[PDB]
Design a protein around this ligand. Structure first.
Ligand SMILES: [Cl-]
Lengths: 244, 231, 240, 195, 243, 235, 111, 241, 250
């Protein structure tokens, strides 16, 4: 029968590792780097677009940074198509919670459920896992500003600063060096851009190969604002820190 | 070789190896004999134990008042198939007030076994059956093979060393077919038949199993001290 | 539906997928359970290749199943969430129908049954998780500590450890734990637990978690400084 | 079932619920507690169809307790009330709807404010300073419209509640065998034993 | 390679080797034939007498579908019974909806599509039988032969099994010597002769002859077995020709 | 790979044969049937001294008149016991009587071959089912993952089975008392066990018509162990 | 509207002695004011020394007897030809009847 | 190399099972041809009956799908009949659902879509057949549309299929280069059939008796096949010129 | 029987590649060249009509397809796969948008739905990925004109101009030299014809080239009058004659 052609995507190696999860992580390590940095007064999300062409429409484009609700965003590393499947599920899940309890969903609860979906694809169903790692940036009134990451295994962890995708080893060492707890958003913006600039596989970091976003309480009084940066705004912030 | 992974695969010479391997399980089973006259049909079965502390595996099963079988091979598979026969005999009685013809019983077993030889995931049944019965056309004896092949016979035997009894019955054909209106003599002929398949062991009181059905006799099984008469 | 029998017997009579799930447990961070005269203590290793962690929000290693029972584990973290969720749901379901919280034995028996089911169901792999389940039965002061594993077998332990280098810490506990006289107090029990982890861990800084469960739903997690005092005290007695 | 009342004052929510369980021409019990604690600072009283009431109450209780254990956190009274409303709003278009009316009294620890929600079996939710289900409201609402002030103490609320029970004991046709009174505030839930 | 390990897989030739392997199982089976005649069809088959213990006349191999169609087959006997069971279901549903008994060409395609369906997936095995069948309908007599692939055609005469080539040669002589047509009673006699002649390819065990027929005049358009005097007469005709 | 329900060329089911190897790795369980009762005994075999041995549960009640001992992958036995208990209680509900021991065993054995591509694999545990009914008296059955069950006068299963069975062949007779059977299980368990037999690493049980199925205390077994050692020294 | 029930009349009677028991019933079968049969037996030997009658709506009565007779047959098949005691028969018949609690057999039953 | 057993991509982006299904197309060793007139569409195919025991009237690869649509198949008969039954059912359902007769090109697209599914879904093999659909469509006029195991389909001025298809194709190309038009400029279908047989004779280089050919003709409101004597009448007309 | 293939046929290899997706992209590389260029007041999509036989009528085979009145699509790779995707794409524009909001979806969202369908063929049981890359051009009120590429993986990217298939590498370089942000629609059509001539070998005329635009509303192509707000489709397929007119002033 069809047994002959079954890859057995949800089995253990003799060493107790999940083949497909390991190979999905190997895939993600070639995707453009994405960095998240959590400050005391906000969060920065920075991501490098995968080798751009000059005829790509840059302003009407979205590849790395997606909005889940008004208080939560994600940076993506891996297959974009796989990520959008999961993003739409996450968007719906947030609305289900809001409909049920009349309160915006706590960040961890959303992260756990999305991570639980990934876990399922590694234990049952015989399907390939999602080749995606997320950086979650969000705010709620319990824990305030929060950064999380999840990967194809469905395992998630919380961070002060973290990178996913390419050159995470080098990126993490640089973040570990210059990060401190009393840091402000504008300092974190600078650290994020400086780290990408040193870890990039490109010749020089320019506005057209970046996506940028902040989550501040820099609205007017006790409320949170999501700012997905426009091309010209990335061009300005790159000049303001003296990278170009 | 490369064509015995499942029942759904033919070999290059047109063989079904899984069905043949199922047939092999019958050959390892303990010998059982079947024979009939015009008035009665008799099953004789050699029972097998695990050791001297164990019981002797029962070989004969009743299906209705007028029908029953003996088994050789995987016993759980015989339980599944006998249960199916019990239901089919029963359906015929409840719906049509009709005793199931021994021939139809054979056709039904054939078709049930066949379906397990043409689909992925399943396996063939690993047991052979000898069905005896008395219906509106007199006494009958059938031989079931898990390939699906069912055959009506005057007498036969299946299991290990069944060839000895099968040869004997082939010689005795003209004698035992005319043992009409005499149960004890038809059994004696069956007990002598199964004796041609014995090696180093002889028929004892908790070793021998005999069943009979006929004109004025419901399907009944004899074990223990009730078979001492025939040793 | 995906049907494949993934857990099957091999010629020598082993189920390799279950045995490989045990290897995932062996890779996981060390977890230890020690029960005293009036308490149970659950200790857990946390690897230190991860700096820049946020410990406020990162999932804790010991989870409350109900107000009176806790569950720690070794192995795949994602797998453990599924077992914890099911256990928490069964806890509330038991309270609803029996009008009494679960016993620790019952909660363990349920979790072990779930694990076993995933070893002979089509289309699923076994859980890469072994658990330590500790607590006190309703209106009872006798300490309870149970262990489960991927195969589905479970049993009660005076003290037990699971995870990487668990054979080293089990060795320690086997000569340092007296059945005739279990740690008489909370302090004694926490110390023996911290000592056993220090055989394997590295630094007694933000690498060790300790959770103490006492009778009648009395569960509290120790902070860094509180644990660090045990680490400091043990090292000074060692230099002798 | 029958009489359930609620009053929200300055610092607490007070729920009063009748003690009688009547079937046919017999009062089977006179000490029935028509309430369930959903969380440490949230209490729900209920009235309606026999069987349905307790079954629904305990089902909600199980779900909120499950949430508490999962998140190691207590849901706000507003959040709990919305969850309960949705369950009843689902129920009303089921094959057999829950015929249960509830009041939810809670103290929001994040806001430091008492909150009282009235929800009927259709899933009709309103936040109120005072509430009642069934025929009780036909006497108590007008009474409370007159005597209630928003800045009252817990003691003033209990006296205001005594005035309601007295009116019901005078003008209601059925003997409801008094009420069990419970207070919800910053320190949780407690029962008044002498009412 | 490995193209022959799974059903429904095309080889680089464009062949389904599993079906060709099922054909080998058919070639291993006993001989069965079909002769089309003036106003009907005749079917005959070789029954190998394995032992003295086989009850004569009591292991019937030819099968009736509805009341007007006969079916015989060579190869795996259980597979043939499965095909006839389906045929009976198909014929019953046709008569249910359309009232009239199923026409032979209509019935032929029902079996054809069903056998063809067992070459479409790797989760089923092809049929290990070639089936000769036919009968009488409103448009007269029809004879068909269906193979494991699902392929079928109409036939003047048909043969399959271990002695198919011997039987085919003998069938071709009848077609050449009788251009106007063969009578039903003659075709019964000829069927006996051809089975006896085809038995030379299976001559270790001696055999038992079984014949059936449908004829507009002789059997009133219904399927009947040939028994007693008409059978013995046909056996004697065959015995005289081999000597 | 290959189908789960595949036959070998010798006419045996691969998975069933492989599960029989798993049972050989299991701890020893012995049963002896007398006219005064049936005795069931097992080796506990704790993997570590810190493990509390009384939590090891390898002898189990099915009903008041039926008990059960296990050997092999013991986690697999839970659903078998659950089924057995439900079958026993259900029969009492439907027929207001005790269910025959043989009928119980047949019901458990019906689960066995319900695997394939139903559960994904056969059970990796063998069961000794002991009980009493009015028709056939005291009975002992050996239930395998093949779906087959034999009645036994005495039977051993597990790692020390073939050596223990040969010993049971010599010792068993049709006039054994219950006390004689108890000692005989202890004697044969002590022979095949790795560690030295005591009340903490071995467990006894019996089923009698009068008192039903009982698991013995560690105190009661300890005295039978002492009575056994004294009798072997006495000649 | 179609009414699935009817009334076939008749009456039955059971008495028990020290070492015997009788089950009697008239042989008349009716609908409305007409006689269907003067001799239609409704007391049956079900095997194992159990006699049974299900009186009321004859279609339901026959169906029940038919199902119980069949229950006796399968009791033998499943429990080594063991005799079905009268108390066990009674309990079995309860489950036959209650199984159709929401579409009842319209009969009084005596064994 | 299990990528050659089921319909998944090979490293070079190919589907071998689809390619091998194309080779099954020529297993019958029969050539077919289709042309268009002013008022009609003619399709012809070789008829080879090797066995003397066969009933020649039952040997056919041309099918009447509906009253207006005809279909000739190149490939084994089991798959051919499978395709024919489905096409008949599809055409019947279309008429019931949408109130008008299914056009030839729409049926072609539908059957091509079904074929495409077998190239993408693993459990279903492709049918080893090429289907040529013919009609006189009420909107588009004379129509020839052809389907293959890849799920490809297109309309044709004329077409040919089989082992010696290329010879017939170029023969037709060279005629339409000469005539400068999209069809056979002829009034009657009889002479369009004669054209079809004539150009098949020239391309294949063989002579045909009445039993070596099979002819289907589509006119307004009906498609029909010709008898042996209808073809014989047509063969005589060619010979006498 | 029944689909026993409930498992993924596309899986990760040790190196992290998804084999079947890579191999699908290889099939797209073999496919005939197609391109798209975005102007200030419109979008053009073009491709070569590779005829299988000169007896075949290449008008009956449409490579450029209308999806909505304001959205069109062209492809490179496997034709049959494209055909069924167009069927599914047309339907999903109705079921998941028009039947809900009473208007046609914006380009980016229809593209998003097609991408989803292609992603699922990469993960679901018993299927291979689609062997095509799509170029989708369209207009909507709030986003204006846009051009998208969709790959076998399900990924999509917005483009000012691009090419896919056989000679895409050279064609992209050609478009980089010629494209500016002030191009008028007629200038973009001119550049599209120039770029395509490089990759086409045989005949280069209106019968071998297929070309459509997304531009001004066409009231004459609406089929009815009387509703002021309905002004006609922005999608228009250029005729064989209209192409030849522009090939003289080339
Ligand atoms: Cl379609």
């Amino acid at each position: 029968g069809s047994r002959r052609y079954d890859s057995r995507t949800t089995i253990f190696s003799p060493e107790g590792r999940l083949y497909q999860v390991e190979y999905a992580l190997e895939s993600i390590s070639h995707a453009g780097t994405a960095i998240g940095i959590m400050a005391s007064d906000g969060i920065v999300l920075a991501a490098e677009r995968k080798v751009t062409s000059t005829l790509l429409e840059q302003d009407t484009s979205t590849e790395k940074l997606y909005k889940l609700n008004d208080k939560i965003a994600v940076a993506v590393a891996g297959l974009t198509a796989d990520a959008e499947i999961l993003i739409n599920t996450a968007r719906i899940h947030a609305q289900n919670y809001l409909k049920t309890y009349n309160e915006d969903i706590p960040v961890e609860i959303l992260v756990r459920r999305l991570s639980d979906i990934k876990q399922g694809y590694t234990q049952h169903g015989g399907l390939r896992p999602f080749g995606v790692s997320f950086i979650y940036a969000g705010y709620d009134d319990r824990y305030g500003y929060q950064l999380y990451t999840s990967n194809p295994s469905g395992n998630y962890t919380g961070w002060k600063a973290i990178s996913v995708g390419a050159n995470t080893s080098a990126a993490q060492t640089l973040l570990q060096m210059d990060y401190k707890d009393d840091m402000k958003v504008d300092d974190a913006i600078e650290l994020a851009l400086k780290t990408l600039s040193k870890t990039t596989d490109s010749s020089a970091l320019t506005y057209d190969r970046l996506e940028f976003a902040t989550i501040r309480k820099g609205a007017n009084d006790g409320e949170v604002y999501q700012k997905i940066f426009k091309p010209q705004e990335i061009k300005d912030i790159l000049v303001k820190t003296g990278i170009t | 070789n490369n064509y015995d992974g499942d029942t759904v695969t033919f070999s290059p010479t047109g063989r079904l190896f899984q069905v043949e391997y199922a047939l092999e399980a019958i050959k390892q089973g303990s010998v059982t004999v079947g024979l009939r006259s015009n008035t009665h049909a008799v099953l004789v079965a050699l029972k097998r134990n695990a050791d001297e502390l164990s019981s002797y595996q029962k070989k004969i099963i009743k299906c209705d008042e007028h029908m029953g079988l003996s088994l050789a091979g995987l016993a759980p598979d015989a339980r599944v198939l006998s249960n199916y026969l019990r239901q089919q005999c029963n359906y015929s009685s409840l719906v049509f007030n009709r005793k199931l013809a021994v021939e139809r019983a054979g056709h039904l077993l054939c078709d049930k076994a066949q379906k397990n030889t043409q689909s992925y995931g399943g396996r063939p049944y690993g047991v052979g059956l000898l069905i005896i019965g008395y219906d509106k056309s007199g006494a009958h004896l059938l031989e079931f093979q898990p390939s699906g092949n069912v055959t009506e016979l005057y007498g036969t035997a299946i299991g290990a060393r069944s060839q000895g009894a099968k040869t004997y019955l082939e010689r005795t054909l003209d004698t035992f077919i005319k043992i009409d209106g005499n149960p004890d003599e038809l059994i004696k002929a069956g007990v002598e038949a199964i004796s041609q398949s014995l090696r180093d062991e002889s028929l004892t009181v908790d070793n021998l199993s005999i069943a009979i059905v006929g004109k004025d006799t419901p399907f009944t099984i004899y074990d223990g001290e009730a078979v001492a008469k025939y040793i | 539906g995906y049907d494949r029998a993934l857990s099957i017997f091999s010629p020598d009579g082993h189920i390799f997928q279950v045995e490989y799930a045990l290897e995932a447990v062996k890779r996981g961070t060390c977890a230890v359970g020690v029960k005293g005269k009036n308490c149970v203590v659950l200790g857990c290793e946390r690897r230190s290749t991860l700096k820049l962690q946020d410990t406020r929000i990162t999932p804790s290693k010991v989870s409350k199943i109900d107000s009176h029972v806790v569950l720690s584990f070794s192995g795949l973290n994602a797998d453990s969430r599924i077992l914890i969720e099911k256990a928490r749901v069964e806890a509330q379901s038991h309270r609803l129908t029996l009008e009494d919280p679960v016993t620790v034995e019952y909660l363990t028996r349920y979790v072990a049954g779930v694990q076993q089911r995933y070893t002979q169901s089509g289309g699923v792999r076994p859980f890469g998780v072994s658990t330590l389940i500790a607590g006190f039965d309703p209106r009872d002061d006798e300490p309870k500590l149970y262990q489960t594993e991927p195969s589905g077998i479970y049993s009660s332990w005076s003290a037990q450890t699971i995870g990487r280098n668990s054979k080293t810490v089990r060795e320690f506990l086997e000569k340092n734990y007296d059945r005739k006289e279990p740690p008489a107090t909370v302090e004694e029990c926490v110390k023996l637990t911290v000592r056993s982890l220090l055989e394997v861990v590295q630094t007694g800084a933000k690498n060790i978690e300790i959770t103490v469960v006492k009778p009648d739903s009395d569960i509290v997690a120790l902070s860094s400084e509180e644990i660090n005092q045990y680490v400091t005290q043990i090292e000074q007695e060692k230099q002798e | 079932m029958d009489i359930i009342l609620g009053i929200r004052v300055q610092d607490s929510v007070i729920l009063a619920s009748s003690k009688a369980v009547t079937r046919g021409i017999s009062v089977l019990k006179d000490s029935d507690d028509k309430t369930r604690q959903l969380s440490p600072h949230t209490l729900m009283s209920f009235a309606g169809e026999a069987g349905d009431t307790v079954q629904f109450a305990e089902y909600i209780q199980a779900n909120i307790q499950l949430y508490s254990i999962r998140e190691d956190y207590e849901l706000s009274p507003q959040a709990v009330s919305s969850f309960v409303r949705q369950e009843l709003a689902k129920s009303i278009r089921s094959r057999r709807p829950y015929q249960v009316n509830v009041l939810i009294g809670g103290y929001d620890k994040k806001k430091n404010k008492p909150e009282l929600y009235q929800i009927d079996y259709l899933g009709t939710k309103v936040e109120l300073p005072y509430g009642a289900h069934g025929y009780s409201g036909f006497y108590t609402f007008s009474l409370l419209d007159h005597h209630y002030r928003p800045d009252m103490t817990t003691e003033e609320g209990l006296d205001l509640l005594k005035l309601c029970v007295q009116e019901l004991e005078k003008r209601m046709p059925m003997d409801f065998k008094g009420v069990i009174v419970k207070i919800v505030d910053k320190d949780g839930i407690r029962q008044v034993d002498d009412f | 390679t490995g193209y022959d390990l799974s059903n429904s897989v095309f080889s680089p030739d464009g062949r389904n080797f599993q079906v060709e392997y099922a054909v080998k199982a058919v070639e291993n089976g006993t001989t069965s034939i079909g002769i089309k005649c003036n106003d009907g069809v005749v079917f005959a088959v070789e029954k190998l007498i394995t032992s003295k213990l086989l009850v004569p006349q009591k292991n019937v191999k030819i099968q009736v579908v509805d009341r007007h169609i006969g079916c015989v087959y060579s190869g795996l006997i259980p597979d043939g019974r499965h095909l006839v069971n389906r045929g009976r279901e198909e014929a019953a549903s046709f008569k249910k909806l359309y009232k009239t008994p199923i026409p032979i060409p209509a019935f032929a395609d029902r079996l054809g599509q069903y056998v063809q369906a067992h070459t479409l997936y790797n989760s089923v095995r092809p049929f290990g039988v070639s089936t000769i069948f036919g009968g009488v309908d409103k448009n007269g007599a029809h004879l068909y032969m269906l193979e494991p692939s699902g392929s079928y055609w109409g036939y003047k005469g048909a043969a399959t099994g271990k002695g198919r080539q011997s039987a085919k040669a003998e069938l071709e002589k009848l077609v050449d010597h009788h251009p106007e047509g063969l009578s039903a009673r003659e075709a019964v006699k000829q069927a006996a002769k051809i089975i006896y002649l085809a038995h030379e390819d299976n001559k270790e065990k001696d055999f038992e002859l079984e014949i059936s027929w449908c004829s507009l005049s002789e059997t009133n358009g219904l399927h009947k077995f040939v028994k007693g005097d008409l059978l013995q007469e046909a056996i004697d005709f065959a015995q005289k020709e081999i000597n | 790979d290959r189908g789960v329900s595949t036959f070998s060329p010798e006419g045996r089911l691969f998975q069933v044969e492989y599960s029989l190897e798993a049972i050989k790795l299991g701890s020893t369980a012995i049963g002896i049937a007398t006219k005064e009762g049936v005795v069931l005994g097992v080796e506990k075999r704790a993997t570590s001294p810190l493990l509390e041995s009384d939590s090891i549960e390898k002898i189990v009640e099915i009903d008041r008149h039926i008990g059960c001992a296990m050997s092999g992958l013991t986690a697999d036995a839970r659903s078998m016991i659950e089924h057995a208990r439900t079958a026993a209680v259900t029969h009492n509900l439907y027929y207001d009587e005790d269910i025959n021991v043989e009928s119980l065993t047949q019901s458990v054995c019906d689960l066995a071959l319900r695997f394939g591509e139903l559960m994904s694999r056969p059970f990796g545990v063998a069961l000794l089912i002991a009980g009493h009914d009015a028709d056939d008296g005291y009975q002992l059955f050996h239930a395998e993952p093949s779906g087959t069950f034999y009645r036994y006068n005495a039977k051993a299963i597990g790692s020390g089975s073939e050596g223990a069975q040969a010993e049971l062949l010599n010792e068993w007779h049709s006039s054994l008392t219950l006390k004689e059977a108890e000692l005989l299980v202890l004697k044969i368990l002590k022979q095949v066990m790795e560690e030295k037999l005591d009340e903490n690493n071995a467990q006894l049980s019996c089923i009698t018509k009068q008192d039903g199925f009982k698991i013995y205390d560690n105190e009661k077994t300890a005295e039978l162990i002492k009575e056994l050692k004294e009798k072997e020294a006495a000649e | 509207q179609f009414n699935p029930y009817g009334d076939n009349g008749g009456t039955i009677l059971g008495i028990a002695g020290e070492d015997f028991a009788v089950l009697a019933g008239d042989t008349r079968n009716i609908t409305d004011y007409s006689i269907n049969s003067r001799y239609e037996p409704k007391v049956f030997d079900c095997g194992d020394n159990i006699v049974m009658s299900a009186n009321g709506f004859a279609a339901d009565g026959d169906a029940l007897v038919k199902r119980f007779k069949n229950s006796v047959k399968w009791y033998h098949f499943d429990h080594n030809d063991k005799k079905l005691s009268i108390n066990s028969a009674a309990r079995n018949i309860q489950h036959l009847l209650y199984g159709k609690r929401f579409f009842p057999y319209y009969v009084h039953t005596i064994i | 190399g299990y990528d050659r057993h089921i319909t998944i991509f090979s490293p070079e982006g190919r589907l071998y099972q689809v390619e091998y299904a194309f080779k099954a197309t020529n297993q019958t060793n029969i050539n077919s041809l289709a042309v268009r007139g002013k008022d009609c569409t003619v399709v012809i195919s070789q008829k080879k009956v090797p066995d003397k025991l066969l009933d020649p009237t039952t040997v056919s690869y041309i099918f009447c799908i509906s009253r207006t649509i005809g279909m000739v198949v190149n490939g084994p008969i089991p798959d051919a009949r499978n395709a024919a039954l489905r096409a008949k059912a599809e055409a019947a359902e279309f008429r019931y659902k949408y109130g008008y007769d299914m056009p030839c090109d729409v049926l072609a697209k539908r059957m091509a879509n079904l074929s495409q599914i077998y190239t993408q879904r693993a459990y279903m093999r492709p049918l080893g057949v090429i289907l040529t659909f013919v009609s006189v469509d009420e909107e588009l006029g004379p129509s020839i549309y052809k389907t293959d195991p890849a799920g490809y389909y297109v309309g044709y001025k004329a077409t040919a299929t089989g082992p010696k298809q290329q010879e017939i194709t170029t023969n037709l190309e060279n005629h339409f280069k000469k005539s400068k038009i999209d069809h056979i400029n002829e009034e009657s279908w009889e002479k369009v059939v004669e054209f079809a047989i004539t150009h098949m004779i020239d391309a294949l280089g063989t002579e045909f008796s009445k039993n070596d050919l099979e002819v289907g003709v589509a006119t307004k409101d009906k498609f029909f096949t010709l008898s042996a004597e209808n073809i014989e009448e047509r063969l005589v007309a060619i010979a006498e010129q | 029987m029944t689909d026993r293939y409930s498992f993924s046929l596309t899986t990760f290899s040790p190196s992290g590649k998804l084999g079947q997706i890579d191999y699908a992209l290889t099939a797209v590389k073999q496919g005939v060249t197609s391109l798209g260029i975005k102007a200030t007041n419109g979008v053009v999509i073009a491709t070569e009509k590779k005829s299988s036989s000169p007896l075949a009528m290449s008008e009956t085979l449409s490579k450029v397809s209308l999806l909505t009145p304001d959205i069109g699509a062209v492809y490179s790779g496997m034709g049959p796969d494209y055909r069924v995707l167009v069927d599914k794409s047309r339907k999903v524009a109705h079921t998941s948008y028009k039947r809900i909001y009473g208007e046609y979806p914006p380009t980016k969202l229809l593209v998003s739905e097609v991408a989803k369908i292609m992603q699922e063929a990469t993960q679901s049981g018993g299927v291979r990925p689609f062997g095509v890359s799509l170029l989708i051009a369209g207009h909507d009120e709030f986003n204006g004109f846009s051009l998208y590429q969709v790959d076998p993986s399900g990924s999509y990217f917005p483009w000012k101009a691009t090419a896919i298939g056989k000679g895409s590498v050279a064609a992209k370089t050609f478009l980089e030299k010629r494209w500016n942000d002030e191009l008028e629609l007629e200038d973009a059509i001119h550049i599209a014809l120039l770029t395509l001539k490089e990759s086409v070998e045989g005949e280069f005329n209106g019968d071998t080239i297929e070309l459509a635009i997304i531009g001004d509303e066409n009231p004459d192509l609406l089929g009815y009058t009387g509703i002021p707000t309905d002004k006609g489709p922005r999608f228009r397929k250029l005729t064989s004659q209209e192409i030849n007119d522009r090939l003289e002033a080339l």
